[PDB]
Copies of this chain bind each other. A is one copy, B any other.
Amino acid sequence: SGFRKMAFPSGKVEGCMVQVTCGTTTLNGLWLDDVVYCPRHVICTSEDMLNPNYEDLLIRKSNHNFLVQAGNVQLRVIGHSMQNCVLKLKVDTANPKTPKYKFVRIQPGQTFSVLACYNGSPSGVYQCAMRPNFTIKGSFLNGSCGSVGFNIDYDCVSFCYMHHMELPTGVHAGTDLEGNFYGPFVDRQTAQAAGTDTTITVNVLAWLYAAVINGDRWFLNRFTTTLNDFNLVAMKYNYEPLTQDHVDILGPLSAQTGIAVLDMCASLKELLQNGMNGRTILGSALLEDEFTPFDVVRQCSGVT
């Protein structure tokens, strides 16, 4: 037992990290097969970032201007192309460390691991959730651009995120591996509105199920609620409305603990209305929304 904000093992992703330099800018790239993916802002200087004309900036670049280094070895660039906000650098050597992989666009409220990198070198790994407003509350410094988010299904790495930018608010924005930004963000140094965020209700309920499985049961009560009643409380407390699809995904946890989903909603309703009264749940003094129902089951059953 015990419950931690656990990341996937990063080994398969560490083997894909490279450093990409173009002019004076250095960032991280992802080397899969004979292609290196990196944020397209690698071609900009500071004077360009206010409103870059990426098409024009890229036209002044040739394959030999993109310096790609995989630790000790330099990679030979034989092609370059911009796809949305990512650059794809064709190299003459397939990465021998390429794992089985997929490019996926994750949904808001879903979680993933991030391997934070600087100069093509991994520094650490942590678990994130894509906020309902398509930002991520990461830990990234200058040079972290090109670090990726991923999930792992035994031997398959599904890459879902590539880091691009830190907004003035200190929150993070990036793209799927086809270079499409999550959220309304654009890759330019401009103040940009992140929408109203909400708490991922299905994740808080999954985490309450994790708490019950792991021995923390003080919040369980004699009450029940309905989806409609629960949603009036969710509305007031800026939580995502709960749907039958969320109840359905909570099925396994409801069965394991014998606590009906609406009964757990009534515990969440009381905790929202009353707070924690200075108590903790799984070492947290707030309601945690960064664990999905799948995450809770995976952590509580031991999937490798």
State the A residues within 8 Å of B (CB).
Answer: 1-12, 14-15, 115-119, 121-126, 137-141, 143-144, 166, 170-172, 214-215, 275-276, 278, 280, 283-286, 298-304
Contacts and interface: CB of A to CB of B under 8 A. Distances in A.
Contacts of A286: 280, 283-285
Chain A binding surface SS class: loop
Contact of A1 (B15, B115, B166): B166
Given A1-B141, A4-B138, A166-B1, A122 B302 contact: no
B5 A5 contact: yes
Number of copies: 2
B140 A2 contact: yes
A118 B1 CA distance: 14
A95 B303 CA distance: 25
15 contacts: A2-B139, A2-B140, A2-B171, A4-B138, A5-B5, A7-B126, A9-B125, A11-B14, A11-B122, A118-B302, A139-B299, A141-B302, A280-B286, A283-B286, A284-B286
Given A137-B283, A139-B299, A122 B9 contact: yes
B126 A4 contact: yes
A110 B4 CA distance: 18
B170 A1 contact: yes
B8 A304 contact: no
Given A1-B166, A284-B286, A11 B8 contact: no
Nearest to A17: B9
Contacts of A119: 304
Contacts of A1: 139-141, 166, 170
A119 B303 CA distance: 10
A2 B137 contact: yes
A8 to B, nearest CB: 6
Candidate in A1, A117, A138, A140 with the most chain B CB atoms within 10 angstroms: A1
A138 B6 CA distance: 10
A10 B283 contact: no
A144 B6 CA distance: 14
